[PDB]
Each structure stands twice: as structure tokens, then as C-alpha cells.
Amino acid sequence: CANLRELRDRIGSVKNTQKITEAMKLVAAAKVRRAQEAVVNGRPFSETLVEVLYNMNEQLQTEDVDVPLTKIRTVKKVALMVVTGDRGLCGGFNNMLLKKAESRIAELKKLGVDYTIISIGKKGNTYFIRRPEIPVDRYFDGTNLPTAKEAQAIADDVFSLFVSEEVDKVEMLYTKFVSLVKSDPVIHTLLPLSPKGEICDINGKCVDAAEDELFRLTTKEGKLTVERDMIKTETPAFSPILEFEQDPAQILDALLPLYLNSQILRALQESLASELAARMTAMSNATDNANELKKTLSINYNRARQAKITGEILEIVAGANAC
Amino acid sequence: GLTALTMAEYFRDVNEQDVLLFIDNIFRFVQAGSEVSALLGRMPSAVGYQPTLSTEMGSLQERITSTKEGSITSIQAVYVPADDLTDPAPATTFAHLDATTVLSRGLAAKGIYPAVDPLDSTSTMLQPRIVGEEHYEIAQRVKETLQRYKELQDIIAILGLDELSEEDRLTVARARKIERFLSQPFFVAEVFTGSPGKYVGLAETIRGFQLILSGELDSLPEQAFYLVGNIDEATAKAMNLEMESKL
Amino acid sequence: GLTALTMAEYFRDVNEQDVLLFIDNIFRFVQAGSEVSALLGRMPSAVGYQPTLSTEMGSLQERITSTKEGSITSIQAVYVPADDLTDPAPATTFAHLDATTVLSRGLAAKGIYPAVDPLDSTSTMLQPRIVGEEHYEIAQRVKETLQRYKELQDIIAILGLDELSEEDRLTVARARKIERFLSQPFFVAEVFTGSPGKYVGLAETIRGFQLILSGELDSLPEQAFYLVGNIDEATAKAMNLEMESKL
Amino acid sequence: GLTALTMAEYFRDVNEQDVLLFIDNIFRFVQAGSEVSALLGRMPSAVGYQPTLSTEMGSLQERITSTKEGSITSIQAVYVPADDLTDPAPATTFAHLDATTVLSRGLAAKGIYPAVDPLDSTSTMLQPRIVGEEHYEIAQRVKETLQRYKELQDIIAILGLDELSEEDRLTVARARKIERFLSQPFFVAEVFTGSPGKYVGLAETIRGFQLILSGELDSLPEQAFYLVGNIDEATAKAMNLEMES
Amino acid sequence: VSRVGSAAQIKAMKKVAGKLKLELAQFAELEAFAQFASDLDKATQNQLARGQRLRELLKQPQSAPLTVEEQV
CATH class of the missing domain: 3.40.50.300 (P-loop containing nucleotide triphosphate hydrolases)
Known part of the structure; x- marks a missing residue:
């Protein structure tokens, strides 16, 4: 009827939209849970790794003439990198991450560093390739899962980027997963690696290693939320004898790239979890908002139907007599 | 009319x-x-x-x-x-x-x-000055529990009962017990199935729902609450299943 | 009348x-x-x-x-x-x-x-025994593709074009190409379009729709299908358009 | 009548x-x-x-x-x-x-x-010869801002504000500032609620709207202009708002 | 809203009721809108707790009216 029919169309489309965003909410929740399960799968390896690194740094008292991955002697050319999520509508994710990126690259151009930037999400590199004012190259992508081969590709490129002292102080912008509503994107130094193992921050909440964060999704009174687990992995300091087949230097030079790769894959996994949870809270807000919209539009459609039919009946009855 | x-x-x-x-x-x-x-x-x-x-x-x-x-x-x-x-x-x-x-x-x-x-x-x-303060309180808490269950029915599809918090996993379990306790075998469903049917006054269902929602019956199986009348008959069904559990 | x-x-x-x-x-x-x-x-x-x-x-x-x-x-x-x-x-x-x-x-x-x-x-x-089995199957596929586009209009409208499925994105591009291609430059409407009128029989447009929806020529630009008499005219229009794009 | x-x-x-x-x-x-x-x-x-x-x-x-x-x-x-x-x-x-x-x-x-x-x-x-070119252009700009706000109301529906890009977000913030500023504690509504009335002349509101639409007042939150008169008083209200915290 | 406004109230209740209405304005904003993530302004520590307490104070028991001084 071109008046009621338009409103029937909008009611149907908003109901279908609510159904679709509810499906996207449940899909994003399952994706967050499977990324959390991948992190729980990867946690034994990282536990034994932050125990073995303490073991090696306990044998040798950081007495070493080696380890190119600890050339900490200047701040010449930082290589900031951003791990970003590759989806549409992405909650409020991309703007936040590249906003922190733009702030820190401005603060780096303050120091005159000629920052080269590595993009990890396709949303990220699509944003980055539009503007070359920021010196950016070597962008990669791993989506829907951080695969060990893709994390190893990132490890290979950043390690080959550090083997030249062109690039030092390689800090990264990974979005840690603090809360379901909003997860602030933190900035952590990666490659100097602080050979005692402790991966430290932007100087004021810097983390000691083997004190690990493993986020766990449990429901509160009733809702979905994430609760952290600050589990501290106990370390058996050394084996009773602890022979070496290698030298004390070669073992660290072959071990610290492994921990670099582990930390890169963790900064992809937690970034992916935070992105999918931002998309999930966007879907939940959108579904509840479309529920409110469907209710209000149904009310408008009902009063429109009553007005239309009543006007029709008044036309008919008043034209009946025509006295 | x-x-x-x-x-x-x-x-x-x-x-x-x-x-x-x-x-x-x-x-x-x-x-x-x-x-x-x-x-x-x-x-x-x-x-x-x-x-x-x-x-x-x-x-x-x-x-x-x-x-x-x-x-x-x-x-x-x-x-x-x-x-x-x-x-x-x-x-x-x-x-x-x-x-x-x-x-x-x-x-x-x-x-x-x-x-x-x-x-x-x-x-x-449903209001308290009408029904009784205890009836209004237990009714409001049963409705809030069933609301919690309709909320968490979205999320037990993804996480599972043990993954989410054990604080309201008890709420999910008690809500299962409530939704099962609500089903009453009637005095007419006998012609369809032969279930003898139980009539339940307000006192019995009040005490039974307080016992379920308070939490005394946290270990009874869910299907011991389904298609039963009073709470004592529900515990009888539960101990019946326990007696057959050996065989 | x-x-x-x-x-x-x-x-x-x-x-x-x-x-x-x-x-x-x-x-x-x-x-x-x-x-x-x-x-x-x-x-x-x-x-x-x-x-x-x-x-x-x-x-x-x-x-x-x-x-x-x-x-x-x-x-x-x-x-x-x-x-x-x-x-x-x-x-x-x-x-x-x-x-x-x-x-x-x-x-x-x-x-x-x-x-x-x-x-x-x-x-x-549009019954097959009356129209031809090939005609009926191609009309069924065109109409189903347009129904899919109408059902994905709302997802396109709000949640971003990319966030729907990737095979459904193929269906959306195919539906766009179809609903442009079914435009005809008329002889009596040459005054409103400015383009000369083109007459096309049933066979040529049938063979055009086949290769359009079959995904085989899903690489042409969209405006190369709009206001086009035939499929070969569309292929030539894609050449003209891609040339004047860079030039 | x-x-x-x-x-x-x-x-x-x-x-x-x-x-x-x-x-x-x-x-x-x-x-x-x-x-x-x-x-x-x-x-x-x-x-x-x-x-x-x-x-x-x-x-x-x-x-x-x-x-x-x-x-x-x-x-x-x-x-x-x-x-x-x-x-x-x-x-x-x-x-x-x-x-x-x-x-x-x-x-x-x-x-x-x-x-x-x-x-x-x-x-x-609202004509050029009638009110001067400046009043006309400011009226056109504020109408444009509010119209684009009402046209993407359908997007700050089901989805969120954060779905917008930067320019849409800025024009939404500007539209919110304007739509708030269009309120005024009346000189006769003192009985209901609100502050005593602030008489606002055209030469004072035109300046405040130049200021807001020039983006120069972005540092202020929306509640600054809500139920205020002149824009200098709006900035003073924001200063006292941050003082009171 | 009441069009007779604060002219009809008591000289006692007028000040405290104006303050309470402004309190409910603040709380209604802070609840209906953002600050679900902790925040910059970090409510439940400035106004949200007291606004919830006020709004849940506003509920009367069924047919138990409060006297003038009691409600003041």
C-alpha cells in the first residue's frame, strides 16, 4: 500500500538484521573461544620456554659475547609494527590501533628515527598504503588464525631486519586483551628482548617474564566477560648436572629467536582475540539496538495501521449516506 | 458469551x-x-x-x-x-x-x-500483599533465575556448562531443575500415556521451589524433576533412579 | 476501452x-x-x-x-x-x-x-514445457540471484559490503552485473538516454545471461554491462571503458 | 480569533x-x-x-x-x-x-x-538581500550540519558511533555541539527549572555559531553549551565544569 | 514535568529537590550513556553509585505514603 508496505519492509529488514547480527555475535564468541583455546594450547611451550630461558641465564650470569638480538646500544631507527584485525565494522578497533600508531610515530619523528613500519593486518596495510608519509614497507597478513608458519614469516622478516643494525629498538603495538567492552592497545618493546627474559613496556608497567597472563572467558552474574589469569610458572632452576652440547653463547643465539617467534605469535593471538571481541561487543550492541529499533518500529507500524484502517472506514461510512 | x-x-x-x-x-x-x-x-x-x-x-x-x-x-x-x-x-x-x-x-x-x-x-x-511475602519472593527469584537461564542459553551453546563460572553454573542447573519441576503430569494426560497425574496445591509447590532454588537439591538429577508432582515425590523419583543405578 | x-x-x-x-x-x-x-x-x-x-x-x-x-x-x-x-x-x-x-x-x-x-x-x-528447458533454468537462476541480492540488501546497507560471505559476495557481484545487464537501449527512448537504440532477440540475450551469471566473464567492469544491447557489446564496452580509464 | x-x-x-x-x-x-x-x-x-x-x-x-x-x-x-x-x-x-x-x-x-x-x-x-550574506551563509552551514546528522541518524541507529570514519565523526560531534547550543534557559521558564533567562542577540549568537562551525571549540565537551546563552558564557561554563570536575 | 514548577513546592523542599533533580539528570546521563568500560571519568566513583542509590530510594512501598518531613 506504499505507506504500510514500506513499514512492513523496514520491520522485516530490521528483524533480519537483528537475526544476522545475533548470528555474528555467536560466531564471534565461538571465534574468541577458539583463539583462547589456541592460546591455552600454546601455553605449555611458552611456560617451558620462560623456564629454560631463566635456566640459561642462571648458568651464565649474562656473561656473553654474542646474541645480535640484544644490541641495545642506541635508539637510532625504531621499527614500530602494528598487528591489526582483518574484518568489517571491527567494532572500534582499527581507529584505536592506528591512532596509537600515529601518536607514537609522531613522537618518534620528534626524535628523528626514520621509523619503518610493519603492518600485520590487511585492514592495517590497506590503511597504511594510502599514506606513504609514514615510512612503511613489508606488510604481511595472518587472519582467522595465527598460523605457526605465518608467525615464523614475521619472525624471519623482523630477525633479518635486525641482523642489520639499520633497525634497532623494535617495539610493537599489539592490542592486549584486558576487557570485553574495550581493550586498550599497548606498546611493548620486542626485539632487544632484555636477555634476562623480561619483556618490558613503554616504561611504567613493564613486565617481568614467567609472570604470564592467560585470559579466560567465564560468564559473570549473567553476560559474557573475560577474566585474566596471572599464573606464575614455577621454574626448576637447573637439571642436576645440565650438560651442554653447544657453547653457552650459541645456545642463546639459537634460543632467543625461538622466544621472539613465540612472543610474535602471542601478539597475533591476543590481538586476534581482542579484535574479535571488539567485533563481538559491536554485534551485541547492534543486536540489542536493533531489538529496541524493532520494538519502536513495530509500535509505529501498529499506530500507522490503525490510523490507515480508521481513515479508510471513515471515508467509506461518510461517503455511504451523502445526504 | x-x-x-x-x-x-x-x-x-x-x-x-x-x-x-x-x-x-x-x-x-x-x-x-x-x-x-x-x-x-x-x-x-x-x-x-x-x-x-x-x-x-x-x-x-x-x-x-x-x-x-x-x-x-x-x-x-x-x-x-x-x-x-x-x-x-x-x-x-x-x-x-x-x-x-x-x-x-x-x-x-x-x-x-x-x-x-x-x-x-x-x-x-503476583504481588506480595496478595499472595504472601514468601510466595512473592520465591516467585520473583524463580523468574529471575529463568531469566538468567534464557540469557545463558545463548552462551552455553558456545562455552559449555563447566567453562563458564561455577557461581552461575549452579544457576543453570537450578534453572534446569525448575523448568523440569514445572511440568506436571495431569489428570487428563493419562489417556495419552498412562501417567497417573498429581494435583499440587500452593503450599507444596512453594516449599518445593524454595528447596530447589535455595539449593538443598543441587545433586538430584534433572530428569528426576520432570513430570513429577510434589517435592517429596521428586526425591522419590531421584532415589528410584539411584536404586536402579546399580543395574 | x-x-x-x-x-x-x-x-x-x-x-x-x-x-x-x-x-x-x-x-x-x-x-x-x-x-x-x-x-x-x-x-x-x-x-x-x-x-x-x-x-x-x-x-x-x-x-x-x-x-x-x-x-x-x-x-x-x-x-x-x-x-x-x-x-x-x-x-x-x-x-x-x-x-x-x-x-x-x-x-x-x-x-x-x-x-x-x-x-x-x-x-x-515461464513453465519449462512451454518456454524451453534452457530458458527456464536460466530464468530460474537469474530470478534466484536477484532474490538473493534483495535478501542481502539489508546486510549490504548497514553492516558493510565486505562483511557478508565470500561466495555470497560472488553472488552479489553476479546479481549487480545481471540487474544492470537487463537494461535495454530502446529506439523510442533514444531521446532520454542519448545512446542509439539496440534491438536484441531472445537467443542473444539468453546466451549473454548464461556467460554473465556463469562466473566465466565476472571480470568486466559494472558500467560495461549497464545500458548495453548485447554481451559482445558489453565486452567491447569493457575495452573502451578500461582504455578511457587510464587515458 | x-x-x-x-x-x-x-x-x-x-x-x-x-x-x-x-x-x-x-x-x-x-x-x-x-x-x-x-x-x-x-x-x-x-x-x-x-x-x-x-x-x-x-x-x-x-x-x-x-x-x-x-x-x-x-x-x-x-x-x-x-x-x-x-x-x-x-x-x-x-x-x-x-x-x-x-x-x-x-x-x-x-x-x-x-x-x-x-x-x-x-x-x-532567510534571504541574501534581507539578512546579509554572513547570516545567510551561517544559517546554511548549520542547516547542513544538522541535516547530515539527521541523515546518518539511520547509521548511529543499529550500529555504533564508532562505525563512522573521521569526517563523519567530526560532523557528528559538531552537530551535537550545535544541537545542544540551540537550547536556552528562557526568561519566563524560570518557574519550571533552569537558570535565569539569558537574552541573546543575533550579533552574539552569530559569533558563537561562527566559533563552533570553525571547529575552534573542539576542546569543549557537549554539556558546555547545554542551556547556556552567549558562547563566551559557554566557554566560562566549560571552565567551571572542569574546575568542579 | 509539572508546568506549575517549583512555585508550588515548599520553601523547605525547594532547594533540596532542585539539587535532587540535577542529581538525577547527571545519573540518568551517566547510566543511559557510556561509561561501561571503566573510563576517563571513571563513574561508580563520582556519581553513578549515588545516582543508583537515589533512584532505588525513589521507590515507595505499595500504598504507604510518606509524610512531609519524612520525605524531606
Whole structure:
């Protein structure tokens, strides 16, 4: 009827939209849970790794003439990198991450560093390739899962980027997963690696290693939320004898790239979890908002139907007599 | 409708007994009134029900009152047209209705007979000064628990009962026990299945729901609560399953 | 309308030749009936037309039948008033009309002329034994693709074009190419488009739709399909457009 | 209505003064016409009113004309019934009136008083030769801002604000600042609530709107302009807001 | 809203009721809008707790009216 029919169309489309965003909410929740399960799968390896690194740094008292991955002697050319999520509508994710990126690259151009930037999400590199004012190259992508081969590709490129002292102080912008509503994107130094193992921050909440964060999704009174687990992995300091087949230097030079790769894959996994949870809270807000919209539009459609039919009946009855 | 009204009104005002009066859809009565008024030619009102809609259906539904002889409490089906309580006939009906309980097709397909929706069914008589403070408190807590369950039914599809918090995993378990305890074997379902059927007054279900929701019965199996009457019979069903658990 | 009908009925009774009559704005044959019926004392019907809408509309549109001496093919151009598809004056004509072609203002909004709805324009001649199995299967696939596009319109509208499925993105691009390709440069509409009119038979457009929806030539630009006579013309238009893009 | 009109017409046409008559609820005149001409035997009309709802009210509006003797600056608080402008009794009012302002219930539901809708309120005097080029251009810019706000209202529906890009977000923030600033604690609404009234001249509001639309006041939150007068007082209100924290 | 406004109230209750209405304005904003994530301004520590307490104070028992001084 071109008046009621338009409103029937909008009611149907908003109901279908609510159904679709509810499906996207449940899909994003399952994706967050499977990324959390991948992190729980990867946690034994990282536990034994932050125990073995303490073991090696306990044998040798950081007495070493080696380890190119600890050339900490200047701040010449930082290589900031951003791990970003590759989806549409992405909650409020991309703007936040590249906003922190733009702030820190401005603060780096303050120091005159000629920052080269590595993009990890396709949303990220699509944003980055539009503007070359920021010196950016070597962008990669791993989506829907951080695969060990893709994390190893990132490890290979950043390690080959550090083997030249062109690039030092390689800090990264990974979005840690603090809360379901909003997860602030933190900035952590990666490659100097602080050979005692402790991966430290932007100087004021810097983390000691083997004190690990493993986020766990449990429901509160009733809702979905994430609760952290600050589990501290106990370390058996050394084996009773602890022979070496290698030298004390070669073992660290072959071990610290492994921990670099582990930390890169963790900064992809937690970034992916935070992105999918931002998309999930966007879907939940959108579904509840479309529920409110469907209710209000149904009310408008009902009063429109009553007005239309009543006007029709008044036309008919008043034209009946025509006295 | 008026014939049923007076055939039950004579019952109450001669025998002084609690008479029931089942009307099929009040909207069908109102539709008949609309037909008869359009036939009389009196100018139709809003959406198209008769002008004397409120007065007509008030004459139908005001003789349904608890006189000092004995109540004539009635149960009236209501078929909202295009499912909106706004239009006059469901509006002038819901101005009268004192307790509205929807029968749910999903609950029927599950087999939680009676299929009355525990959450959306509302009554103006639930309030504490009417029922009793304990009844209002336990009823509000059962409805809040079933609300928690309808919320977490989205998330136990993804996480599972053990993954989410054990604080409200007890809420999910008690909500399962409540939704099962609500299903009563009737005195008519015997002809379909042979279940003998149990009649449950308010005292028994009050104490049983307080025992379930407080948490004394946190270890009884869920299916020991399904299709049972009182709480003691439910524990009898549970210990029956326990006695057969050896074999 | 009845004068034109009498001329056609003579050409079908006496000359025995298949006369093609055109009526346009047949809705006026109901509107004039309304304007005289209101005066004539006959009471008003629904939304304001005459009471004898059905009998008068049938009294016109039933005389047009192939009657074993000839065949009167007729093309009435109903005027769906203000896009009221439910209005009685087109609603009773949809009963009489074989090959309805519901043109839609929403599809002339984006410039796709003719703005025939690919969905609603339906015919009693899209049965396979009548039209050809290849014709029927290609029409089924085109109409299903357009139905998919209409159902994904809301997802496209709000949640971003990319966030739907990737195979469904193939379906959306295919539907876009289809709903542009089914635009014709007419000879009598050369004044409004500026492009010369192109006539295309059924076979050429059939073979065009095959390769368009089959995903085999899903690489051309969209404007290379819009306002194009044929599929080879579309391929040449893609060359011209990609050349003038860089140049 | 007619006797108010004749009372004002004697002081305009004869004694030559700039008479103002504030005919309140001129819709009630048309509704009284509906009553009488439903009972007078005259045939009914559109939705309920008299058949002469565009000639009786025509007789009321057309006698209020600024003649060569004096002018009658009339204000008529015509009342749309059931909140839809498409009603015939204010529809025939729209054609006669030339400084129409539509007090939508939306803005008063949100709390922004006065609830003058900024899109719908228009005038015949919003012209270049009439008001100067600066007033005209600022009016056009603020109308554009509010219109783009109301057009992506369908997007700050189901989705969130954060779905917008940067320019959409900035024009939304500017539209929120403007839509808030369009509120004013009246000089006669002191009885209901709010501060004492702030008289705002055109030369002061035009400067505040230049300031807001020039983006220079981005540091201020939205609650700064809400129920304030001049923009210097708005900035002072924001300073005291941050002081009070 | 009441069009007679604060003119009809008592000289006692007028000040405290104006303060309470402004408190409910603040709380209604802070609840209906953002600050679900902790925040910059970090409510439940400035106004949200007291606004919830006020709004849940506003509920009366069924048919138990409060006297003038009691409600003041």
C-alpha cells in the first residue's frame, strides 16, 4: 500500500538484521573461544620456554659475547609494527590501533628515527598504503588464525631486519586483551628482548617474564566477560648436572629467536582475540539496538495501521449516506 | 458469551461454588459484535470494531466477579490480530484481564507439558500483599533465575556448562531443575500415556521451589524433576533412579 | 476501452486475423468508473473506487481472449497508483493478466531502464514445457540471484559490503552485473538516454545471461554491462571503458 | 480569533501602531470550526474538520497583513494534533505562515529547550538581500550540519558511533555541539527549572555559531553549551565544569 | 514535568529537590550513556553509585505514603 508496505519492509529488514547480527555475535564468541583455546594450547611451550630461558641465564650470569638480538646500544631507527584485525565494522578497533600508531610515530619523528613500519593486518596495510608519509614497507597478513608458519614469516622478516643494525629498538603495538567492552592497545618493546627474559613496556608497567597472563572467558552474574589469569610458572632452576652440547653463547643465539617467534605469535593471538571481541561487543550492541529499533518500529507500524484502517472506514461510512 | 455467563452465574448464585467459565477467543466475540453492529448500520468506530465495544465486552466480562455467594472466575482465550496489544479489542480486553499466561509452541515441542511459558506469563495477582511475602519472593527469584537461564542459553551453546563460572553454573542447573519441576503430569494426560497425574496445591509447590532454588537439591538429577508432582515425590523419583543405578 | 475492444472484436470476428490491441492506463477505465459511480448513488467501495470494480474490470478484460477465429494479444499498461501494489484497481487486474510485468520506481531510481522488477515481473509462460528447458533454468537462476541480492540488501546497507560471505559476495557481484545487464537501449527512448537504440532477440540475450551469471566473464567492469544491447557489446564496452580509464 | 484580529486591526488600520497579537492555539479555532460544522449540518471533510478549513482560517490569516498604515507582527502558536505535520488543520496553516517553526517533541524528550526543530523551522526571510550574506551563509552551514546528522541518524541507529570514519565523526560531534547550543534557559521558564533567562542577540549568537562551525571549540565537551546563552558564557561554563570536575 | 514548577513546592523542599533533580539528570546521563568500560571519568566513583542509590530510594512501598518531613 506504499505507506504500510514500506513499514512492513523496514520491520522485516530490521528483524533480519537483528537475526544476522545475533548470528555474528555467536560466531564471534565461538571465534574468541577458539583463539583462547589456541592460546591455552600454546601455553605449555611458552611456560617451558620462560623456564629454560631463566635456566640459561642462571648458568651464565649474562656473561656473553654474542646474541645480535640484544644490541641495545642506541635508539637510532625504531621499527614500530602494528598487528591489526582483518574484518568489517571491527567494532572500534582499527581507529584505536592506528591512532596509537600515529601518536607514537609522531613522537618518534620528534626524535628523528626514520621509523619503518610493519603492518600485520590487511585492514592495517590497506590503511597504511594510502599514506606513504609514514615510512612503511613489508606488510604481511595472518587472519582467522595465527598460523605457526605465518608467525615464523614475521619472525624471519623482523630477525633479518635486525641482523642489520639499520633497525634497532623494535617495539610493537599489539592490542592486549584486558576487557570485553574495550581493550586498550599497548606498546611493548620486542626485539632487544632484555636477555634476562623480561619483556618490558613503554616504561611504567613493564613486565617481568614467567609472570604470564592467560585470559579466560567465564560468564559473570549473567553476560559474557573475560577474566585474566596471572599464573606464575614455577621454574626448576637447573637439571642436576645440565650438560651442554653447544657453547653457552650459541645456545642463546639459537634460543632467543625461538622466544621472539613465540612472543610474535602471542601478539597475533591476543590481538586476534581482542579484535574479535571488539567485533563481538559491536554485534551485541547492534543486536540489542536493533531489538529496541524493532520494538519502536513495530509500535509505529501498529499506530500507522490503525490510523490507515480508521481513515479508510471513515471515508467509506461518510461517503455511504451523502445526504 | 452471555449465555455461558448466565449459565455459570446461576451455578454460582444457587450453589455457592467456584465456577469456571471458558470462553473461546474474546476477539472472536468482539468480531461477532463488529459484524452485528455493521449489520445494524451504526457508524463503525476505530479500526472497525463496533462503537459500543467497551460497553458490550464490559457487559460480557464484568458479570465475571467474585460475588459473596461464590466466585465465577473465568479463563478467556485472546487472539490478538496481527499480534499487537494496541488496537482497541485486545486493548479493551487487556484493560480487564487480571492474569495472562501464554502457552509456548517451543515449550510444547520440547514436551514440558503444560506448555505455559514460565517467563512471559504475567499476573497482576503476583504481588506480595496478595499472595504472601514468601510466595512473592520465591516467585520473583524463580523468574529471575529463568531469566538468567534464557540469557545463558545463548552462551552455553558456545562455552559449555563447566567453562563458564561455577557461581552461575549452579544457576543453570537450578534453572534446569525448575523448568523440569514445572511440568506436571495431569489428570487428563493419562489417556495419552498412562501417567497417573498429581494435583499440587500452593503450599507444596512453594516449599518445593524454595528447596530447589535455595539449593538443598543441587545433586538430584534433572530428569528426576520432570513430570513429577510434589517435592517429596521428586526425591522419590531421584532415589528410584539411584536404586536402579546399580543395574 | 470498450471502443478499442469493439474494434478488436470485429477484427477477431470477421477478419479472423490476430489483432494486437494496446490499451494504456487501463487504471483510468476504473478511475472514471469511480468518478461517475460516486455520483450515481452507488455507495463507495474500498479505498475509493466504484463498488462494481471487479465486474466492470472483468467486463473489459474478459472480451480479450483467443476465440478460435483469431487471437487478440493485448498489452494493458495498468497504473499502480502511487506504487500501491495492493490497491484494488491493479489487484483485480493481476487476476486477469497472464504475463504481468511489474515495473518498479525503486529500480528506476538507480537508472536501470526499463525499471521492470526482475522478481515480480512473472508470467504464466515461464513453465519449462512451454518456454524451453534452457530458458527456464536460466530464468530460474537469474530470478534466484536477484532474490538473493534483495535478501542481502539489508546486510549490504548497514553492516558493510565486505562483511557478508565470500561466495555470497560472488553472488552479489553476479546479481549487480545481471540487474544492470537487463537494461535495454530502446529506439523510442533514444531521446532520454542519448545512446542509439539496440534491438536484441531472445537467443542473444539468453546466451549473454548464461556467460554473465556463469562466473566465466565476472571480470568486466559494472558500467560495461549497464545500458548495453548485447554481451559482445558489453565486452567491447569493457575495452573502451578500461582504455578511457587510464587515458 | 476574529475579535482579537479586529481589536488589533483597529489599532493598526486607524491609530497606526506596530500592533502585535499573539493568537494562542489557532488550531483551536479550526477545531471549534470542526465542532460547529459537524453540528451545523454541513458535510464533513478531511479527517474530521469542517469543509471550510481553508477559507475560515483563510479569513483569519488573510486579515493579518501589514498594510500601508501599520504592520501586525502576529505570532500564532498553531497546534499540530497527534504530532504529525501532515494533518490538514496545520497543513493549511503552513501555506499561510511565513516564519514557520516546528517544535518537535523529540528535542523536548531529549531535554533541549526550546525544542525548535532546526531542520524544519524555516522562513521566507532567510534571504541574501534581507539578512546579509554572513547570516545567510551561517544559517546554511548549520542547516547542513544538522541535516547530515539527521541523515546518518539511520547509521548511529543499529550500529555504533564508532562505525563512522573521521569526517563523519567530526560532523557528528559538531552537530551535537550545535544541537545542544540551540537550547536556552528562557526568561519566563524560570518557574519550571533552569537558570535565569539569558537574552541573546543575533550579533552574539552569530559569533558563537561562527566559533563552533570553525571547529575552534573542539576542546569543549557537549554539556558546555547545554542551556547556556552567549558562547563566551559557554566557554566560562566549560571552565567551571572542569574546575568542579 | 509539572508546568506549575517549583512555585508550588515548599520553601523547605525547594532547594533540596532542585539539587535532587540535577542529581538525577547527571545519573540518568551517566547510566543511559557510556561509561561501561571503566573510563576517563571513571563513574561508580563520582556519581553513578549515588545516582543508583537515589533512584532505588525513589521507590515507595505499595500504598504507604510518606509524610512531609519524612520525605524531606
